[PDB]
Design a protein around this nucleic acid. Structure first.
Ligand SMILES: [Mg+2]
Ligand SMILES: [Mg+2]
Ligand SMILES: [Mg+2]
Ligand SMILES: [Mg+2]
Ligand SMILES: [Mg+2]
Ligand SMILES: [Mg+2]
Ligand SMILES: [Mg+2]
Ligand SMILES: [Mg+2]
Ligand SMILES: [Mg+2]
Ligand SMILES: [Mg+2]
Ligand SMILES: [Zn+2]
Lengths: 114, 82, 177, 101, 66
RNA sequence: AGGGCUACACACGUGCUACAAUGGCGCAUACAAAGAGAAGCGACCUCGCGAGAGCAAGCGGACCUCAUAAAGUGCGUCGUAGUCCGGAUUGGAGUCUGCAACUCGACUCCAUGAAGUCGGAAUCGCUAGUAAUCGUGGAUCAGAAUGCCACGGUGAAUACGU
């Protein structure tokens, strides 16, 4: 339970545990476990060292937590330093893809100020 | 976005202006209205003035602005605050 | 060491020819590179000074000295002797190593890089730059950095004049827009 | 509708019909993979641009044939909602009765 | 120099996209795989005489129709 | 021609989605009604994880297509946790319509995985195939619905009384 540099949980099935990797959801998790050949309903606790090692290799073949953070943050910074419309929206902390901001922009603006 | 089978989009007048500028032009910013035209690597190093509704904002092309149309870098709604 | 040897042979001989000197030691040698970060927000975020010191340690393999306020300034709300910055001085092999690292790795990574400002001499042949983004330096992790803060660098040189300093740096293959 | 919306739509219809079967073949050229995409498709895109915009059927608003109202149109009667109701209750629309089920 | 206050300043190999590989004593913790270096930068050798392996080709040249 | 009606320190109305286990997910299996179609619906076959793409018949329609109904039933799992609840935001990669999808379309894949733990003053609908929920169709429509108008599936509780 030390895949990709995190401490993926015990007592959870393989899919649910590998969901905890920042960059692996349900689909990528099941793809990794299928490539590794293990049944999907078995806990991480009862996975042997070699099986965990091939899981680590496949996760490394995919993108990992800190790496994914690095590219997503550089893409955001790329938008900002281009100063496109999306760069302006990211800088301002307003919705970027064209939602209404007269109302319903709270998840992007934070709670109401006054 | 625009599909791959159709290729990117660019206004033909913009193509002619950019081609003329790169082959025999270092004079003046290219006054363009096509906010819908994708940026190609031909217009690198140009300083084109793109319309945003009332005036032409200058935008200087850089190595990374690739899959962006000219309107991405021209604001249309001035807003200071409240 | 590599660019040190390149200096000692090629730059020494070509500058000798360029300046028509009588002695070898008359060629501009280099004393040091001083890297400063005038943090100036430690008052708000005291831990920002620690972050900057660790950051400078990452660029150059030296624990920085905490530069303290020379005297109290009411305009900037600083007192006398308050730790308002960090510095590292590199001279010798570590100087040369940071020098190759900078010139060959960090400089081309500058965002929209159009060369360096070709007029940044004090007046007797010592050069200086200010880099806006620390991220240009490969030693940065970009994940354990709270703020994208810049720094400034000063190559202090034995050059007799601005032209001698510029010639030395050009022999060292600087951009010089 | 000012007579000018009406004239505009009339010329849009005329221009779209007079360029029809050219825009269609250009769309086919852009769509079909079997046709060369290097230069032929590119020139097709450029020509499709150089064709006047009003020739596109997408610029049809389907105004009312009588009052040129843009909103409330119905294709079956070719009339706005209110003119449909007026003509219906007068009896000029065949087979139309106030439904109730 | 002083002991047990400086960071680790081990040797690393820095390889970039153009095939330039250089050995440098630095403080990173592992080998470096960068992209742009002295030789493979436009301004260094020819402002309009360089080729890239990034945005000008990757996102575009695999998709363009010209 | 472009921009704006899509601007956002804020308030309000009307809705959709949730806060979960009467449920989330995977597999198998059932049962509708009512509509629309020719510069349109578009089988089958092949391809793509998918949006969808190529070829391509039938149909002016009790004949062909849209069109795999969904809730449900059984099988397993999840185990009361902000979780396999939530899918809001955000990056990358795309499909289609259209001259063009950046301002400013909808969907598809991956990843990101917010508030929300049943909601104060107050306040709305409904007396039965009604409320509640489940899905399907239509007009508008090149593309663009949680809206509007229709259609069926399950299917209540209560009405002492003024
Ligand atoms: Mg994950
Ligand atoms: Mg609005
Ligand atoms: Mg229309
Ligand atoms: Mg009219
Ligand atoms: Mg107009
Ligand atoms: Mg939902
Ligand atoms: Mg019929
Ligand atoms: Mg949460
Ligand atoms: Mg979560
Ligand atoms: Mg009643
Ligand atoms: Zn290189």
């Amino acid at each position: 339970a030390r895949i990709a540099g995190i401490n993926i949980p015990d007592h959870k099935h393989a899919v649910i545990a590998l969901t905890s990797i920042y960059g692996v959801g349900k689909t990528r998790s099941k793809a990794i476990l299928a490539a590794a050949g293990i049944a999907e309903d078995v806990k991480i606790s009862e996975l042997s060292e070699g099986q965990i090692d091939t899981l680590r290799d496949e996760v490394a073949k995919f993108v990992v937590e800190g790496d994914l953070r690095r590219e997503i943050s550089m893409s955001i910074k790329r938008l900002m330093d281009l100063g496109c419309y999306r760069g302006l929206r990211h800088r301002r902390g307003l919705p970027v893809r064209g939602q209404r901001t007269k109302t319903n922009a709270r998840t992007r603006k934070g709670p109401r100020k006054p | 976005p625009r599909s791959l089978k159709k290729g990117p989009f660019i206004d033909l007048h913009l193509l002619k202006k950019v081609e003329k500028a790169v082959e025999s032009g270092d004079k003046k910013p290219l006054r363009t209205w096509s906010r819908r035209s994708t940026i190609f690597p031909n217009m690198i190093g140009l300083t084109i003035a793109v319309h945003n509704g009332r005036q032409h904002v200058p935008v200087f092309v850089t190595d990374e602005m690739v899959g962006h149309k000219l309107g991405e870098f021209a604001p249309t709604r001035t807003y200071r605050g409240h | 060491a590599k660019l040190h040897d390149y200096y000692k042979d090629e730059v020494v001989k070509k500058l000798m020819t360029e300046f028509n000197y009588n002695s070898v030691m008359q060629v501009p040698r280099v004393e040091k590179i001083t890297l400063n970060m005038g943090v100036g927000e430690a008052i708000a975020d005291k831990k920002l000074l620690d972050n900057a010191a660790a950051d400078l340690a990452a660029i150059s393999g030296q624990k920085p000295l905490i530069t303290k306020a020379r005297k109290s300034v009411a305009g900037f709300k600083i007192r006398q002797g308050y730790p308002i910055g960090c510095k590292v001085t590199l001279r010798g092999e570590r100087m040369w190593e940071f020098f190759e690292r900078l010139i060959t790795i960090a400089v081309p990574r500058i965002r929209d890089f159009r060369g360096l400002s070709a007029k940044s001499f004090d007046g007797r042949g010592n050069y200086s730059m200010g880099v806006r983004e620390q991220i240009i330096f490969p030693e940065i992790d970009y994940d354990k950095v709270d703020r994208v803060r810049g720094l400034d660098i000063t190559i202090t040189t034995t050059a007799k004049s601005d032209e001698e300093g510029r010639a030395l740096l050009a022999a060292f293959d600087f951009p010089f827009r | 509708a000012k007579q000018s919306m009406k004239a505009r739509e009339v010329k849009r219809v005329a221009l779209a019909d007079k360029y029809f079967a050219k825009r269609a073949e250009l769309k086919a050229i852009i769509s079909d993979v079997n046709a060369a995409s290097d230069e032929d498709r590119w020139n097709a895109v450029l020509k499709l641009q150089t064709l006047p915009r009003d020739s596109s059927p997408s610029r049809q608003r389907n105004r009312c044939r009588q009052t040129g109202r843009p909103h409330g149109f119905l294709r079956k009667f070719g009339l706005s909602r209110i003119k449909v109701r007026e003509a219906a209750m007068r009896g000029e629309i065949p087979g139309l009765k106030k439904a109730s089920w | 120099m002083k002991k047990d206050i400086h960071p680790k300043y081990e040797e690393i190999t820095a390889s970039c996209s153009c095939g330039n590989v250089m050995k440098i004593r630095s403080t990173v913790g592992h080998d470096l795989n960068l992209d742009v270096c002295s030789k493979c930068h436009p301004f260094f050798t020819g402002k309009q005489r360089d080729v890239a392996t990034g945005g000008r080709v990757d996102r575009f040249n695999k998709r363009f129709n010209i």
